[PDB]
Amino acid sequence: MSEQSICQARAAVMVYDDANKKWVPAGGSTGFSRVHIYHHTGNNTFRVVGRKIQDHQVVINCAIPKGLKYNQATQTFHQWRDARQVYGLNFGSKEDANVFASAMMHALEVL
Ligand SMILES: CC[C@@H]1C=C[C@H]2CCN(C(=O)[C@@H]3CC[C@H]4C=C[C@]5(CCCN5C(=O)[C@H](Cc5ccccc5Cl)NC(C)=O)C(=O)N43)[C@@H]2C(=O)N1CC(=O)O
């Protein structure tokens, strides 16, 4: 397989609607997702890909660039921003937040 999952964590994936200063559910679909970080070993790249638990819709698919600032705002809500959007993960548990942050931080160390 070209891409290998390095973690799976449960979270409600949010994107920030700057115009209304409000978080809104990614993909317009309230509820929780299974959120992976996938590693493409060929070029050592990483992306966050999350799918709704119910209907499998992909609600996030974003690259993790070198130098990203991953903000652990709370024990259960982490966020980061790129050139177009601000993403937030409202984790199902502190354990899920810890798993995801570990993998993210690993990725950011090896990029
Ligand atoms: C899904 C509900 C949600 C859950 C939990 C809480 C936790 C706190 N919180 C926030 O939205 C916080 C409070 C202040 C506000 C102000 C601005 C925001 C919003 C937009 C981005 N931002 C930044 O602070 C970024 C972070 C950053 C730093 C460094 C690198 C990257 C980033 Cl992204 N700052 C820049 C300058 O990039 C922000 O997160 N905000 C969440 C929240 O209240 N709710 C409840 C609701 O919304 O009802």
Short mmCIF file of C-alpha atoms and ligand atoms in Angstrom, two decimals, residues 14 16 18 21-23 69-71 73-74 77 79-81 86-87 90, ligand 1:
data_model
loop_
_atom_site.label_atom_id
_atom_site.label_comp_id
_atom_site.label_asym_id
_atom_site.label_seq_id
_atom_site.Cartn_x
_atom_site.Cartn_y
_atom_site.Cartn_z
CA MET A 14 -14.65 21.26 12.61
CA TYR A 16 -13.70 27.67 11.12
CA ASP A 18 -14.12 33.18 9.67
CA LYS A 21 -16.54 33.60 13.67
CA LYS A 22 -17.99 30.14 14.22
CA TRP A 23 -16.87 26.54 14.04
CA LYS A 69 2.01 24.78 14.35
CA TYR A 70 -0.30 22.22 15.98
CA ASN A 71 -2.14 23.92 18.79
CA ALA A 73 -5.88 24.38 22.88
CA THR A 74 -7.44 22.01 25.43
CA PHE A 77 -9.72 20.18 21.23
CA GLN A 79 -6.39 22.84 15.95
CA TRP A 80 -4.15 23.92 13.12
CA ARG A 81 -4.23 26.20 10.18
CA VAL A 86 -8.51 26.48 10.12
CA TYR A 87 -9.26 23.01 11.31
CA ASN A 90 -13.10 17.96 19.03
C1 LIG B 1 -16.06 23.15 18.43
C2 LIG B 1 -16.42 24.06 19.59
C3 LIG B 1 -15.14 24.63 20.27
C4 LIG B 1 -14.45 23.77 21.16
C5 LIG B 1 -13.43 24.07 22.10
C6 LIG B 1 -12.91 25.38 22.33
C7 LIG B 1 -11.40 25.48 22.57
C8 LIG B 1 -11.22 26.97 22.51
N1 LIG B 1 -12.04 27.35 21.31
C9 LIG B 1 -11.97 28.33 20.41
O1 LIG B 1 -12.77 28.40 19.46
C10 LIG B 1 -11.01 29.36 20.63
C11 LIG B 1 -11.46 30.36 21.74
C12 LIG B 1 -10.93 31.70 21.24
C13 LIG B 1 -11.18 31.64 19.76
C14 LIG B 1 -10.42 32.49 18.96
C15 LIG B 1 -9.86 32.15 17.73
C16 LIG B 1 -9.88 30.74 17.29
C17 LIG B 1 -10.83 30.41 16.22
C18 LIG B 1 -10.11 30.49 14.94
C19 LIG B 1 -8.68 30.06 15.26
N2 LIG B 1 -8.49 30.43 16.65
C20 LIG B 1 -7.38 30.47 17.36
O2 LIG B 1 -7.40 30.72 18.57
C21 LIG B 1 -6.07 30.14 16.60
C22 LIG B 1 -5.39 28.92 17.27
C23 LIG B 1 -4.10 28.55 16.71
C24 LIG B 1 -2.92 28.90 17.36
C25 LIG B 1 -1.71 28.57 16.80
C26 LIG B 1 -1.68 27.83 15.65
C27 LIG B 1 -2.86 27.48 15.03
C28 LIG B 1 -4.07 27.80 15.55
CL1 LIG B 1 -5.50 27.36 14.69
N3 LIG B 1 -5.31 31.38 16.46
C29 LIG B 1 -4.72 31.80 15.34
C30 LIG B 1 -4.28 33.26 15.46
O3 LIG B 1 -4.43 31.11 14.32
C31 LIG B 1 -10.11 29.83 18.40
O4 LIG B 1 -9.83 28.61 18.36
N4 LIG B 1 -10.79 30.23 19.49
C32 LIG B 1 -13.10 26.31 21.10
C33 LIG B 1 -14.47 26.79 21.23
O5 LIG B 1 -14.77 27.88 21.80
N5 LIG B 1 -15.44 25.95 20.89
C34 LIG B 1 -16.83 26.33 21.32
C35 LIG B 1 -17.70 27.08 20.37
O6 LIG B 1 -17.17 27.48 19.33
O7 LIG B 1 -18.88 27.33 20.74
#
